[PDB]
């Protein structure tokens, strides 16, 4: 009871659970929450990517808001070289997924004075004209700002606020022309080139999937990516458009809808139904809606995804100060812990890994915090609530999964080992949020990579030949999981583990739960 | 959701659960609570015993407060003839247990005027001398009453109350002699022969196990009884004395301690620890302690037995009016239902089946009420509480049992089929109080009879030869349970059931839970 | 914590609450559940009625199924003489209500051989003709039975069951004529004169309010009765008919609807809405619907009445054996306790007080059991649930009432003293089920009598002249309650009590809650 916050785990009230949280109670070795890292100049070499995997990276995110297809194909090649450098030891091999994050309907400014490093000073109170004349697309300065959204004058009015560069620069429309705006700088600062622009409260009519997004999604299918993070999803038809673009060839690629505007929050239920998962894309979200309301949208979305059993990712500025510093702020440590306590399946790093000075430290910090927070979850009430908000069904696979999770709590198992082809049987267990790590054994490499979207799934890729007798092949895969758990420090000989298997080969036959000692 | 009170089952508060109880919601066919019937002149013929089994009798109770060993051996012979008359169809055969109920430390009066039918009228206010002179042991009348407790004057004082015949006649000691008492009749009535006497508040020093109880317990071992109901257990050493008398030859006979005095209630925890189960023996209990407090002692004992996972029986006057009438009173219908809602594993009939005019109707009524009450249990909160008050242990059999019960709730299974040698694996499931009936398949006849002590266990005695391959023998026994469930109307082809089995032959290896459709 | 089951009261689970119930934990002196006694030959003398009030009788029930208006007027006169014999001490005076119970749509048989004591033996298997020919209304025998329901042949068919005398005699229709039936005796026995007949499953078309019921309701208004118990209410329009008959002169008389048939249970919600309260009339109910389902209907109705804040009475055969015996059966003790644990505001005695040999003992037993059961209620969960199923409203009187109940739990108050004119402010407190007795001080005699319908209200009738300053008159009434509580052993000097008063004279102004020490 001294380890894994087990004294707090036994409290019969949430208040007593909080009172019992102990900084001297060590967590288990397993870290359940997936870590997604944005790849960029600080992290795209093979040598660095090997250290990133060792530090805890589970998913490499390619941001298609920047870079060419040649640049992204080279990043994907380096991710695969680094990942496969560990393949010779299947017991320790960690699958690594590749995620394509779309540019989507962004608004960007032009180049300052023709240079990429040049910057201009916008002073509070000063006038700033917004133009759509392409003659100034590379001649932006303190007096005139070009932007690429050709219909901007139709969606804003006098008094409208315009935010630039992560909402740090604020402008207010004072005069509106047919194809230009005259604004006053409210919050000033230094303006650089190609910065993001947000129009809160405006009904921006850019397509959810542009011609560029189509080329990028099709490139993703050609490159065999595991998932797409679709930017600025506002409604179910936007998700259906992405699904249509991926088509038959991309039918197994997971679609994660990014919620980053008010409409996405309002139409969340229909977006969730149509998507494979959700990303709480807090950067844009916190500019589109008041920054003080983002925690409400985050908790609502994580709650509804946990209720639906679909993966949810918490993203953006989680450890922001680590772009320049080797340790995070206290707010950043708290943010990562609370995202895990809320129920996030995955947490993400953006600039911290893409361009920062301490990418490895940032990955290691998310690993350390997530593991501490996982032990601090009040599983007593969470499991009780997940069970009650779960329908009574004649699905034998769901009854086996909940039976396995209940049994894992009763014996404080070292793991729940699950044999899975498509990943579904392992996802069914993860939906009940066990404390024990879920070792999902599969022979399907894509299933192993995609498993990282779910809290607690440790996918392991079995490379052994298939045994002719089904029972012997099941035993071989279960033995492979026992070896993985022992090697990774999850459990040891004599400990008790839960094992889930099916009665015949193929998908959808998981019906057997065994409680067995580790050999 | 219309059947088995499933609408009330889904309520998230106990008050809403009560509001949703529906008289038009039909229960399932299975009736989980064991029915124990006292055998006597109204029910000891083979023909009547066959009808008693068909009506729902699971255990035949032999009351050793009356009758000779020859009389009881003939009753046991008739119970076995009636039970085995159904053995030719194992699918429908219902095992029937034999219970020996000890006389224990009773106090009895003598014979009125030398006759067994003669009665005298005791009027309120009249004087009545209690004598210990054996010259009057067959000459009791309205002036002098002989009783067999030779030390009565040492344990009572002036003012002491003495109750006679189910506490219906009340006397108060007015004068005390060296070996006689002079009393005043408080509550009068007609006094018959050999009536029971209770001395509430007196420290009666009769032995827990008398020379007669020793002969009777040894006779029970010779007759192969399944369980003993030990009268007036006051402390753990009394249980150890019964255990010593049964000895090595009777080591598998279950000891149920009867709690019927204040000391038994005060020292309940130590009695429960030493016993195999408990009987709330309300007749004597309600005379030894104030009648208005019996429900407190009943609820406390049923609560502590459910918490400990030991069988508890509710007994005496449950359907008392049915000794003379074909329908029970409203209080009697309520009593049986509330004993089941409290958590009683078994309910009992005494005079209703032993000497009454409607034994079959009384058995049928307990069956009907118990089945209605079983559907009305608030399993949502009961299961949650049983799980929380259950220790985390490395016992794989307990983790499998709780996993099976959780899975049975998730798919509203038709049954939990359990293969068991000693009965333990089935008892482990019953302790979690599933709504689904537990079909316990065994080849051990004593295990099949003793299983009736636990709520929800339907023991079935497999008579098929053992198959040489363990897997084929397991499959044969599971198929036998599928046939029993279909034949008895518990489930049908295509329904989902939970199946619990072990990994090797023998006791203590239950570790596999399967969710399978009925063939 | 040793008294009033306070150790069990602190348990955080219902199972641990049961485990902690202690037969040695004394209850408080106050007994909260009202006791309603049916008056008859055993209890209608002034001398006996004085002993009945001293024993615990709170409401005298007049059964209009028997007796003339002259007989009932004399009973009411004797009840009032006995009640007012204690009026000279207002501190100890216990108000006593008068309830009129209607005959309603009953079916009765004729006289056997012209005598009231004559009986015939109906043997199982024998034929019995049911006639409607008035020539045989006083010539009933083993061959022919007259009954007063002229349309019986239109509502029954071949195979229909007919029950006679508390459902003890059962007949099955074998042949149906135009105005007679030929039946076979299923359950035989001795048939007397003018016995009640039930036709389960038949749509009996007798009026809810007959010409006799109209005369009886109008007589009730003339006699100043406090409440009416309306027999066989099946729908809301039946309640509206009773309300119309009582009219303007009887507008303050409470209407308690008796639920005693399947239609009454099915249309319960509309009946409850239209009524002032409900009676679970178990005698007829347990013949109209299967006896094994009555506990479901009882728990459903008590649950819905507690949820609605309307009084509910549990009635019939609660202590039935005490008609002939001085002590009840164990099922009867359990029935009374479980009715109180279920949430019944009142419990009732019928034959036990009307014609039995031990009326005073029966009243005393209900008092003793109810007080023990009141301490055993799990107030921790009950109060939590009542609060959650209570709407947020701008009614200041409801906020004051719930605040007072919360404060009473916090300081384990000796009482909640409430000043009330119409009774409403005291009813508002009782609806939250505090453990503390509610001392309702009123100057309205009818309000004092009607208060007995609600659990926990101890009405006290203030006879002091009104003080000219409102604050001094409030203080006088609060001091009167302090004197009542001290005299009746509810609390003593220095204890803490809760006091609820209003800001101005009149009804509907209760808004002040004070926590004060007893002077
Ligand atoms: C954050 N949190 C929870 C978290 C969980 S699992 C998701 O960790 C389970 C129940 C709960 C709960 C229940 N009640 N409250 C309210 C509350 C109760 C007592 C103390 C505090 N600080 C809050 C919560 O905040 C709360
Ligand atoms: C009888 N009973 C229970 C029975 C069960 S299972 C044993 O049927 C589970 C919880 C409970 C519970 C919880 N709270 N209360 C108190 C309560 C709450 C709401 C309404 C009422 N009438 C009582 C019970 O009496 C109670
Ligand atoms: O797109 C994102 O991830 C964001 O805006 O945070
Ligand atoms: O012995 C018993 O069963 C009793 O006293 O009820
Ligand atoms: O009318 C009644 O009270 C009954 O039937 O129980
Ligand atoms: Mg964004
Ligand atoms: Mg006894
Ligand atoms: Mg009636
Ligand atoms: Na468990
Ligand atoms: Na479940
Ligand atoms: Na409080």
Residue numbers in the entry:
A (entry chain A), B (entry chain A), C (entry chain A): 13 to 531
Paper text:
Pyruvate kinase muscle isoform 2 (PKM2) is a crucial regulatory enzyme of aerobic glycolysis and catalyzes the penultimate step of glycolysis, producing pyruvate and adenosine triphosphate (ATP) from phosphoenolpyruvate (PEP) and adenosine diphosphate (ADP). In contrast to the isozyme PKM1, which localizes to the inner retina and has constitutively high activity, PKM2 is under complex regulation and is principally expressed in photoreceptors in the retina. Tetrameric PKM2 is the high catalytic activity state associated with ATP production and catabolism. On the other hand, its non-tetrameric or dimer/monomer state has low catalytic activity; is associated with anabolism; and is favored by high nutrient availability, certain growth factor signaling, and a multitude of post-translational modifications.
Considering the comparable potency and target activation achieved with compound 2, the crystal structure of PKM2 in complex with compound 2 was sought to gain insight into its binding mode and assess if changes to the core scaffold resulted in fundamental differences in the target–ligand interactions. The asymmetric unit contained one monomer. The monomer within the asymmetric unit contained a single compound 2 molecule, and each tetrameric PKM2 contained two compound 2 molecules with the small-molecule activator spanning the A-A′ interface, as previously observed in the co-crystal structure of PKM2 and ML-265. The PKM2:compound 2 monomer also co-purified with an oxalate molecule, which is an analog of PEP, in the active site. The binding pocket for compound 2 on PKM2 is distinct from that of the active site and the endogenous activator fructose-1,6-bisphosphate, which is in proximity to the C-C’ interface. As a two-fold axis exists at the A-A′ interface, the binding pocket for compound 2 contains equivalent residues from both protomers that make up this dimer, and the small-molecule activator can alternate between orientations based on the two-fold symmetry axis. In the binding pocket, the pyridazinoindolone core of compound 2 was observed to be sandwiched between two Phe26 side chains with the aniline moiety forming an edge-to-face π-π interaction with a Phe26 side chain. This aniline moiety also forms a direct hydrogen bond to the carbonyl group of Asp354 and a water-mediated hydrogen bond network with the sidechain of Asn318 and carbonyl group of Asp354. The sulfoxide of compound 2 forms a direct hydrogen bond with the main chain nitrogen of Tyr390. Additionally, the carbonyl group of the pyridazinoindolone core is involved in a water-mediated hydrogen bond network with the carbonyl group of Leu353 and the side chain of Asp354.
